[PDB]
Design a protein around this nucleic acid. Structure first.
Ligand code: CL
Ligand code: CL
Ligand code: CL
Ligand code: K
Ligand code: MG
Ligand code: MG
Ligand code: MG
Ligand code: MG
Ligand code: MG
Ligand code: MG
Ligand code: MG
Ligand code: MG
Ligand code: MG
Ligand code: MG
Ligand code: MG
Ligand code: MG
Ligand code: MG
Ligand code: MG
Ligand code: MG
Ligand code: MG
Ligand code: MG
Ligand code: MG
Ligand code: MG
Ligand code: MG
Ligand code: MG
Ligand code: MG
Ligand code: MG
Ligand code: MG
Ligand code: MG
Ligand code: MG
Ligand code: MG
Ligand code: MG
Ligand code: MG
Ligand code: MG
Ligand code: MG
Ligand code: MG
Ligand code: MG
Ligand code: MG
Ligand code: MG
Ligand code: MG
Ligand code: NA
Ligand code: NA
Ligand code: NA
Ligand code: NA
Ligand code: NA
Ligand code: NA
Ligand code: NA
Ligand code: NA
Ligand code: NA
Ligand code: SR
Ligand code: SR
Ligand code: SR
Ligand code: SR
Ligand code: SR
Ligand code: SR
Ligand code: SR
Ligand code: SR
Ligand code: SR
Ligand code: SR
Ligand code: SR
Ligand code: SR
Ligand code: SR
Ligand code: SR
Ligand code: SR
Ligand code: SR
Ligand code: SR
Ligand code: SR
Ligand code: SR
Ligand code: SR
Ligand code: SR
Ligand code: SR
Ligand code: SR
Ligand code: SR
Ligand code: SR
Ligand code: SR
Ligand code: SR
Ligand code: SR
Ligand code: SR
Ligand code: SR
Ligand code: SR
Ligand code: SR
Ligand code: SR
Ligand code: SR
Ligand code: SR
Ligand code: SR
Ligand code: SR
Ligand code: SR
Ligand code: SR
Ligand code: SR
Ligand code: SR
Ligand code: SR
Ligand code: SR
Ligand code: SR
Ligand code: SR
Ligand code: SR
Length: 237
RNA sequence: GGCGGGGAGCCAUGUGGACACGACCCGAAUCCGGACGAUCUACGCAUGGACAAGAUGAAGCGUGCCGAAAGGCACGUGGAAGUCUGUUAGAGUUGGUGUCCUACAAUACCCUCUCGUGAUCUAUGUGUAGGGGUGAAAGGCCCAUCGAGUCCGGCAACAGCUGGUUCCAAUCGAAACAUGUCGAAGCAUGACCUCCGCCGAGGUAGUCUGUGAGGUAGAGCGACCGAUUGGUCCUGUCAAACUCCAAACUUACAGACGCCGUUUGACGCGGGGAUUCCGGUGCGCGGGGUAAGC
RNA sequence: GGCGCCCAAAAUGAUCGGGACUCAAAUCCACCACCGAGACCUGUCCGUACCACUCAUACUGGUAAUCGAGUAGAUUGGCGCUCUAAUUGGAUGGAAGUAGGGGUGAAAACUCCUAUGGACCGAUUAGUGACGAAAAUCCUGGCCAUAGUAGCAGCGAUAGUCGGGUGAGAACCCCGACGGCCUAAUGGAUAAGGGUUCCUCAGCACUGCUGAUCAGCUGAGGGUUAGCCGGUCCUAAGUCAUACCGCAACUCGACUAUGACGAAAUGGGAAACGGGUUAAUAUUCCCGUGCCACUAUGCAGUGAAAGUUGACGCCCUGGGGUCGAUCACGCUGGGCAUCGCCCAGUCGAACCGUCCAACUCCGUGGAAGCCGUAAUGGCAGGAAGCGGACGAACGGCGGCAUAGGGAAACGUGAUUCAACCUGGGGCCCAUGAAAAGACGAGCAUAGUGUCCGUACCGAGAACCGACACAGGUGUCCAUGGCGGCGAAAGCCAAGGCCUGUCGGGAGCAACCAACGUUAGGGAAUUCGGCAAGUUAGUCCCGUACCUUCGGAAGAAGGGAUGCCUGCUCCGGAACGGAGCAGGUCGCAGUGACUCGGAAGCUCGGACUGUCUAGUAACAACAUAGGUGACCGCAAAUCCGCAAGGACUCGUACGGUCACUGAAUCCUGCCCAGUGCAGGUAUCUGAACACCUCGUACAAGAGGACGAAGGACCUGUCAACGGCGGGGGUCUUAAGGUAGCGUAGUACCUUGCCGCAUCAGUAGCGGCUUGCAUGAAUGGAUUAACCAGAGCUUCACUGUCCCAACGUUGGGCCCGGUGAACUGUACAUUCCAGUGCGGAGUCUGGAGACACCCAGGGGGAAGCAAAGACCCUAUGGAGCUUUACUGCAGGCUGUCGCUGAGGACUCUCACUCCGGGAGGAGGACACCGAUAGCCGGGCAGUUUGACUGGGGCGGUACGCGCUCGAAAAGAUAUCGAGCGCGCCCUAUGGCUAUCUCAGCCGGGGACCCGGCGAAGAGUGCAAGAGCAAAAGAUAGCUUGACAGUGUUCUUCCCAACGAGGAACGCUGACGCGAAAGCGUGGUCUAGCGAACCAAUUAGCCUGCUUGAUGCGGGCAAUUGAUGACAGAAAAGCUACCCUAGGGAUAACAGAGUCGUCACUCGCAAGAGCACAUAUCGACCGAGUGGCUUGCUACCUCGAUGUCGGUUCCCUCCAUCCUGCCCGUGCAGAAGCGGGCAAGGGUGAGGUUGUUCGCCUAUUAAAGGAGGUCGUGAGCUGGGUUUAGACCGUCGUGAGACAGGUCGGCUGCUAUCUACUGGGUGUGUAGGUGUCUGACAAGAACGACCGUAUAGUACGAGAGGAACUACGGUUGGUGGCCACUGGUGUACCGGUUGUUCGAGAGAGCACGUGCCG
C-alpha cells in the first residue's frame, strides 16, 4: 500500500510543522547565579500564539527583558522574583524546596535547570505535596504523583487562561484558525473512509474497520493505528 | 543375468538436424537501475492583492413607563453573522443530456444555475519527489501521462498467443490418432509420411478349403435369471447389464489359385528428416438427447 | 389393388432452375433411336521409372493394361542477383540502364531489333553471400480518386456605403462624408513571458481563411541616453557553500557553527518636478526649477545615545481633506436657430516657507449630576469652562511664476468628497514579519555620484496553448455624463475600432441553428412540465403550520405606482429623503431595461464548507458536538542506513491514535471465538555460560536453568462482532430492550385498509408476522439550510391536440481560396434461392438508355478504435488475508562496552541535567552482535486440470467388474449398474476324512433314512472357476521363504516407469506312501519416482603416511507425493491492463420444437330429454416458428441493449365493418360456425416497462412478421463501467441473476436505394393535339339520427328490417369569399438615452415594449 498519514508526519514537511517563525519565546525559567537577589517588573501582557494563553513580559534589574510563563493574577507593574530567597507569592520562582507544602505551582522543571517542563498549559497546575532532603512529591495535572528533585524550580500559582476549554468551537472555521497556529494537519479523514491502499481500516463496500481496533504495541509504524495497546475500551464495565 | 570381445579410426570441406545464446522477422501488458520533473496540479509556508450596492438587525448602550428589588415592556441606538439578495470584482458549474464533436478549442460557446467577509478568492516567491509526496478521501493530483510520473538504460525481456517468411521443376506423400505430461491453443514417445544404408527370397490387399476363436442380429425361456396376464392343466407377455439355441460376419494359422518380389531387391532390419496429435461428411452399426446443420 | 381428392394457416414478389405442359413435356409398364466428360479407344509429343548399349546421369533403341491429381512434410535437378579468382570475350564504328517490339525455354529465365542513353559490360569454371516479395492495420518516398467537395456563416462585437487618392492591378492600402461597433473594455499604464516583433525607405516569390499597392511578411538602414524610475542595498518563507559528523563511497545525508544567497508589477527603501524636442527615447536628451548622499574646505558644535522611526491583523465609524463630478454667477471660444437653450475652456508642479484638527500632556478652575458622542463613554484618583506645551495631510495659504502652457479668457463661491491625513469603538481557544536604513544631530561653498535595465507587444495577431487558436494569462486606472440602491441594465462622452478580416447573387425553396407570434383547449405531452413560460423593482396593508424562539417570512393574500400645477415636513444643505391638494393621458406608468412564480407532504444529510482537472456535486468527504485509546516529556506517535529529525519557542485545559457526526430523547443483553491488556503456583518456552556422555581435540547426543511468548486465569464491546432454531432449553457467550418498520433495508409485492384521481405498480397515512430493522457497525427524531431523491395543488404556457406564419445566420447559384475521412477488385439493381446457416458480385427470373443537380439517410451485417463483456494463457498489475515463503520493525534473553566491594552496596567507564561548580543515574541504559516471540508494515510468489462457455455442483483425476461395445482385438461421453485404497497367523499352506443349499419321511435344536451337478460355500463389487474340491471338518505346518531370471501385462496393434501375473533355474523347507502340492487368500481391485532418513548383512573407500573419530559407496527394506508417471502454494479487482479466440458465453441470426401458440381425429361426459345449439376429459395426429429451452453453425482486427417514438411494407390463426349457416333462432339481443385481409382498430391513470391492472369513450378499440423492422432517425426512463448508501454474505480485499441516488450517445454519403429536378443520345425539319402498353390509389372507410314505426314479432315487457333522407367521424385532394393565425410591409401609442428644446430621428438583437 501507501504510507499512512501518521508516517507522512515524521518526515517533518511544511504541512506538518508548527509555525515556529511565528512563535514568540520558550518560557524557560531565567537562570540565577545564586543567593536569589533577582527581581523584575512586569512591563506588559501578551498573547502566546503557541499556547493560546497569555504570557508576561518582565524587565529584570540587570536589564534583561524576557517573556515569562505567566500564572493567573500577574498584572503590569507587579514585581516578580526568581531565586531561593524569593518571597512566596504568586508569580515567583523558587526551588520546590523553598515552596511550602500545599501550594499550587506551575512550569515545573523535570531536572534542575531545564527551565520548566510540567504544567504549562492553560489553567492547569501541579500541587506540591511532600517535602524532604531527597525528594519533593508533586501532583501533576494528570493526577499522577510525581517524584522530583527538590532542587527543581517552579512558579507559584496556576497557569493563566483557565477555562479556555469551557467554550465550544461551534464552527469548523474557528477550529481552523487555531489549528493554523499549531504543528497539526487538520481536518481529519477517518481511515475507515479511505481506500484499502491508504490505511488499515480502508476499503470495504461499507465503512467499518476490517479488524479489531486494538493494536499491539509492538505493531510496526504503518500498522499501529486505532486503539493503541488499549488496556480496555468502551465505557461499560 | 548386465555390459564388453575375431583391428577402424583421426582430421578436413560441404550439407541435414539438436542445445545455449536475440537464434527466421515483427508483434504487449511487465519487472529492475540511474536520472529529470511541484512552469500543471495537491497541500503547507513567506510577502502582496481583491470583494458595487442593498437586506436582515445579535450583544452592548440609551430613554421612557412599571417595579421594593430582581428585573420587565416600548421605542431608539448599535452593527454582529463560516447571515441573506446580488452576472460589483472574483470563484464555480445544476440543467439544456442545447451549439460544437475532421471543433475556435486533444475539455470550447450560449442561456439557466451556485458562491460572493470567509474553512473566501488570488499573484509571486518558497517547500514536499516516485512505492515516495500531496489528498476535507474521488485511487483524486504530482506539466494532455497515475491502482505507482517522465526520460534513458537493463533490452534485441519472455510468450506454448496473432501476423508475416521473397525463384522454377522432378520423385514420394501424410497426421487430425495412442501412451505420458500443472496436460488439454504446448510438448515428448509411438502410429503414419520421406530419405539413406544393410539384408537376400520370399510376400499376402482378394477368394476357396482345412484346423481353431467368438455369443452380435434373430430367436427362445415346462433351459437359467428377473420381469410380466387371467381362469377352474390351460391362457397373455418381455430383457443393454438372461441364454437350452444361434447366424450373416469378424478373426488366428496353414495349403491352393491369384497378384507381387528376386537388374524396379519385395518381406525385414538399422539410421537421418519431418509434418502431425482443433478435423469434417456420406453410408453401416451405434450410445445419450423430444430433437438438432446436437 | 392403382392414381387422385379432403385433412393442408405466415409474414417485400407465386413457382418444377424458368418458359410452360393435360391421349402430357405427368405417373406407371415395356420398347426404339439418339445427345452427352479430361472416363474408355486411337495418332504424335513430354516427363518419370525400368531395360539394352555406354565412361555417361551424353546419344540411340526398347518396355509401362499393371506410370502420370495432391495440403503439411521428406528427397533431387535447375533459373536469377552481389563481389573474388582462374580461363576467355564485348564496348565511343556506342557499354550498362530504360521504353516499345521480334525469337527461344514447360518454367525460373535467356536473347535479338528499334529508340533513348553516353561509359562501362559479360561468359565458362571454382568460390562468396546483408541473393529473389503481392501480402506482415509491414517501412520510407512518391501519386490518384475523394473534390473544385467540407471550411472561409453561427459567439450579444450582424458593418459598412458613396465619392476620391496611389497604383500595371484596388470590396477589403490611404483621405473625406454618411452609417456603425467597444465603456472594468475593443480605451490608458504596466508584471511575467517574447526578443527587435519598434521607426524609416524600398518591395510582394514566402506568411496572411479571398485580394493586396497593405502588414507582426521580404530587403536595407536606423532606434533604447538617468545621482534623484527600477536594479543595485535589507532582511521573509526558504536555498546553497565551507566546517563538523555520517556513509563502503559520492555529485548523497540531518543537526550545529560561519558566510553567502533569497522580494524589478506586489515587503522595507536617501533624492525630481513642469515644460519642450524626435520618424523611433525621454522624471534619462534640452530648458527652467528643485532635491539627496558622500567627500573637501570654512564657520558653528561638543553634544551622540537614550529614545523615536522603519513596523504592520480583521470588522464598524467620526473628523480634516484634494482630484473628480455637479450647482450658482462672470469671462473666452464654439454650436443651433420658431424657442433660448446646448457644448468646451477658464490652467499652472516638485520644491521652499508657513497654518493645524485629532491624540497626549500642563496650569487654572472646582462639578457630589453635570460634560460629551454617530456609538462607546468621562469625572473629587478633579468634569465643563479658560489659558498653555507638544502636534497632520499626496491638504490650505505665499513663494516657485514679467517659469511654463493657451487662439482666447487666463474665474469666484458652494455641495458631495477617491487619494492622502488624524481619531473613536468592537473581535481573537486566531494576536496579525524581519533587517538594512532614517530621525535624534546646524549652515556655506565646491567636487563626486560609477555599473546594469530602459525599443515594442502585453493580447479574439507580438505571452502559453504545434496557428495571426472564440481557450488560458497577474496589476492599477472602481469617481466621465444620463440612469438607478448600485462598480447593475440600457443609452452616450474622452479614447479606440470597422481586423472577434473573404466576397457577390436569388422575397432568398426543402432542411438545420438561434429567435418572434400563434385561435380554442391547458400538462392531454414526457420516465419526469425536460424545454419554454409564469412571477418580478418599490411603498402600504396583511401573513399559517411548525420552531432549537434565532427563524419560518419577501410565507400566502390584497392594494398602490406616470405626467403636470402648487405645496408641507425632516435636514445646514444636496443637483438628498418622506408626504399633501388639484389637474390630466394611455390598452398598459418597476410602460424599455432591470426585476422571486407560490403552497403542502415524504426521504437524506444538521448547517457554511469538500470532491472525481476531462461523463458522478450526491445521500459521499469535512465539520462543531459525543466517545474510546496512548503518554509525565530521557514520554506517547512518527521520519532516517547512519549522523540525526517532525511533533516542539509544545507539556495532560497538552497532542498523538482512532470511531461517531449539530441540537433534543436515548444508547439494552453478550467477554464463548478473535483482538488488546493485566496476572500467573504449575506446564511449556531459544541462545550464551554450566554439567554429563562422546571425541587425546572438534563435530554430535543429553541435562540443568528458564526471558518475553504460549497453556491457564482475569479485565474490556462508544474493540472486532453477535442478539437464532426448537419447546412450555440447544448452539456458540447472549437471544433483540427503547424505538423504528413493506424502509434508499420487505423476496413474496402492484402486501391489506384508507386518502387523492374518471381511472394512481406512484405519493402519503395506518396496519406490519421485520425473506434478511435496531441503538456511537449508533437508534429515534428534528426547526433551519439544500443546483440532493419522490409526490400533490394553484397559477402559466405551442410540452401536447396540430400545426402555421414570420426574423437573423447558413443552406442554393457565382468569383477566389481549398483540405480530410475512405479506397482488394469489379459494381444500374430488384425478388427469391443457394452458400460457413445474415449475397450489388453465386443460381433462376425480373428490371435496367447514359450523365448531372438537390434531398432525407433504407442497405453496403456503412466509417471510426487488433471487443473494454465472456473464455483461454503454467500472461501483467493494484488490493486482501489466520495462502506459501521471506524482509523490516517492536518486545525479550545473552555476549562485548564493563569497573570495585539469587540478592545487595559502590564509583571509575558510559548516559542525562547544569553556563559553571556541580547535580541525577550507573555498570544498567545507549550502541555493536546474537537468540526466542509478535510481525500483510513491506517484498516475491502461488492459488492445477476435467467441464455441451465459465462459476457453483461433481470427478467420469489412480484402480477393479457387468453393460454400453456392433459374436477376434481395440473403442468415447458429466454413459447405465457398482465397487477398491483393506481385512485375515488363519480367513495361509499340506494331508486325512467328507459333501453342500433346499425338500420329504421317522423320533425351525440334535438323531436316522431318502431325493438332491451345485440353487451352498469359497472375507469384500461384479462377472467368472470349483464337488472323491478350489467347499466342510480334523490334524499338522509356516512356501505370506531367500537368490536370480524368462514371458506377458501395465502400454491390443506400437515406444514408455512403478505396480501385477503366469512360468523357470538355484537354495532351504512343510505336508504326503508317493506322484505331488505350497513363489499367500480360486481369478480379475487393495497402489507410489528421484533426493534424504532409519533399518539389514557383508564388503569398497576418504587427497604424503599410520592410528582413532566422523564421513562417502555397492544391494535391499521402511517412511509419500489420492492432482495417484510425484511443485512446498489462498483470494478480490466494476480501477483495471496485454495477448488471442467466434477454438467459448452475453444480443441477433441459423438448426431443433420438449416448451409455447394454433389445428385436426376419436367423443367419454353434460347440456331437464337429447354427444354434436353449446361445453367438452382421456388418448391420438399435426401445422406454425410468436414464447421458452437446447445446440454452439456465423460474427470477438465490434452486427450498439430493453421500452418508447417516428415512418414504410406485410401475414391471417378475423376484434369491427360486408355476405352467409346453425341455434337451447318469436322479436330485440345473444351464442357458435363459414367466406372474407378493402378499410379500421383510437384517448387516458400507476409502472422504464414489454406485459398487465384500471377509467371513460367506441362499429371494434384483434394478434403477429419485417436483424424480438426502425440509435451513420430520435429518446435514454430500464439494463450494464468508473462515485455512494442499505440489506444479506465474507476475517478481509470484496461480492450479490437484491434495492437505491448520480453518471457520455462520434462521422463533411464514395457506391447502392428511393423522393423530386435537369442535360444528352436513340426512335429520325417543326408546331399543335392525342393515343395508352403498362404504373399508383382507400379515395374512400365507418357511425349516429329521422321517416319506415311504437309498426312486423310478442300475453306483456320489449321491439326490428327493405328503402328514402339529414348529419358526424377518420382518411384523401384542393382552395382563401367567410372565421381564425401570422404578417421584424405599414400606421399609431409609449419607457430610457443621445442628437440643446421643438420638429424629426438613432440605439435598447436581429421589432425597446405595446396596440
Ligand atoms: Cl484544539
Ligand atoms: Cl530444369
Ligand atoms: Cl469619534
Ligand atoms: K463479435
Ligand atoms: Mg473536543
Ligand atoms: Mg473525520
Ligand atoms: Mg472511498
Ligand atoms: Mg472505489
Ligand atoms: Mg493496508
Ligand atoms: Mg458511517
Ligand atoms: Mg462504521
Ligand atoms: Mg436599528
Ligand atoms: Mg518448387
Ligand atoms: Mg525436372
Ligand atoms: Mg434381441
Ligand atoms: Mg573458361
Ligand atoms: Mg526488393
Ligand atoms: Mg461529395
Ligand atoms: Mg513611446
Ligand atoms: Mg485572428
Ligand atoms: Mg402517455
Ligand atoms: Mg427645514
Ligand atoms: Mg420512498
Ligand atoms: Mg450537506
Ligand atoms: Mg468530472
Ligand atoms: Mg470530533
Ligand atoms: Mg451498544
Ligand atoms: Mg498477479
Ligand atoms: Mg503482498
Ligand atoms: Mg519473477
Ligand atoms: Mg470386442
Ligand atoms: Mg524406517
Ligand atoms: Mg498423471
Ligand atoms: Mg462457434
Ligand atoms: Mg478474432
Ligand atoms: Mg380464414
Ligand atoms: Mg430490435
Ligand atoms: Mg439503423
Ligand atoms: Mg448513434
Ligand atoms: Mg451522423
Ligand atoms: Na502364393
Ligand atoms: Na479583409
Ligand atoms: Na452616476
Ligand atoms: Na467475547
Ligand atoms: Na493494477
Ligand atoms: Na424500439
Ligand atoms: Na380486412
Ligand atoms: Na398504460
Ligand atoms: Na441488430
Ligand atoms: Sr524548553
Ligand atoms: Sr535551555
Ligand atoms: Sr474497511
Ligand atoms: Sr455497557
Ligand atoms: Sr508554484
Ligand atoms: Sr455569506
Ligand atoms: Sr447530464
Ligand atoms: Sr435553450
Ligand atoms: Sr465535447
Ligand atoms: Sr449570493
Ligand atoms: Sr529497451
Ligand atoms: Sr466386430
Ligand atoms: Sr505429374
Ligand atoms: Sr505428382
Ligand atoms: Sr501418386
Ligand atoms: Sr534480403
Ligand atoms: Sr489531392
Ligand atoms: Sr460575415
Ligand atoms: Sr459556431
Ligand atoms: Sr502579383
Ligand atoms: Sr508596425
Ligand atoms: Sr540580495
Ligand atoms: Sr518595491
Ligand atoms: Sr467627510
Ligand atoms: Sr516605454
Ligand atoms: Sr483573451
Ligand atoms: Sr468617441
Ligand atoms: Sr485578409
Ligand atoms: Sr403582431
Ligand atoms: Sr403531467
Ligand atoms: Sr400523464
Ligand atoms: Sr403583489
Ligand atoms: Sr446527536
Ligand atoms: Sr476475550
Ligand atoms: Sr446530405
Ligand atoms: Sr493362486
Ligand atoms: Sr473466502
Ligand atoms: Sr463500485
Ligand atoms: Sr385464408
Ligand atoms: Sr361481423
Ligand atoms: Sr407485470
Ligand atoms: Sr440511461
Ligand atoms: Sr445504340
Ligand atoms: Sr330508426
Ligand atoms: Sr314501451
Ligand atoms: Sr433595431
Amino acid at each position: 500500500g501507501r504510507r499512512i498519514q501518521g508516517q507522512r508526519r515524521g518526515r517533518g514537511t511544511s504541512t506538518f510543522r508548527a509555525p515556529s517563525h511565528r512563535y514568540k519565546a520558550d518560557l524557560e525559567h531565567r537562570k540565577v547565579e545564586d543567593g536569589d537577589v533577582i527581581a523584575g517588573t512586569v512591563v506588559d501582557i501578551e498573547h502566546d500564539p503557541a499556547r493560546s494563553a497569555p504570557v508576561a513580559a518582565v524587565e529584570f534589574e540587570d536589564g534583561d527583558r524576557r517573556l515569562i510563563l505567566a500564572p493567573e493574577g500577574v498584572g503590569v507593574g507587579d514585581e516578580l522574583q526568581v531565586g531561593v530567597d524569593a518571597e512566596i507569592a504568586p508569580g515567583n520562582t523558587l526551588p520546590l524546596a523553598e515552596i511550602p507544602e500545599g501550594v499550587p505551582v506551575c512550569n515545573v522543571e523535570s531536572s534542575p535547570g531545564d527551565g520548566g517542563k510540567f504544567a504549562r498549559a492553560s489553567g492547569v497546575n501541579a500541587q506540591l505535596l511532600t517535602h524532604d532532603r531527597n525528594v519533593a512529591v508533586v501532583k501533576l495535572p494528570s493526577g499522577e504523583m510525581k517524584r522530583l528533585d527538590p532542587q527543581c524550580r517552579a512558579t507559584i500559582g496556576v497557569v493563566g487562561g483557565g477555562g479556555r476549554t469551557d467554550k465550544p468551537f461551534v464552527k469548523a472555521g474557528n477550529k481552523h484558525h487555531k489549528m493554523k497556529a499549531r504543528g497539526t494537519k487538520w481536518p481529519n479523514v477517518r481511515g475507515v473512509a479511505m481506500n484499502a491502499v491508504d490505511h488499515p481500516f480502508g476499503g470495504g463496500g461499507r465503512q467499518h474497520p476490517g479488524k479489531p481496533k486494538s493494536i499491539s504495541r509492538n505493531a510496526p509504524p504503518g500498522r499501529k493505528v486505532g486503539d493503541i495497546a488499549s488496556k480496555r475500551t468502551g465505557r461499560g464495565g
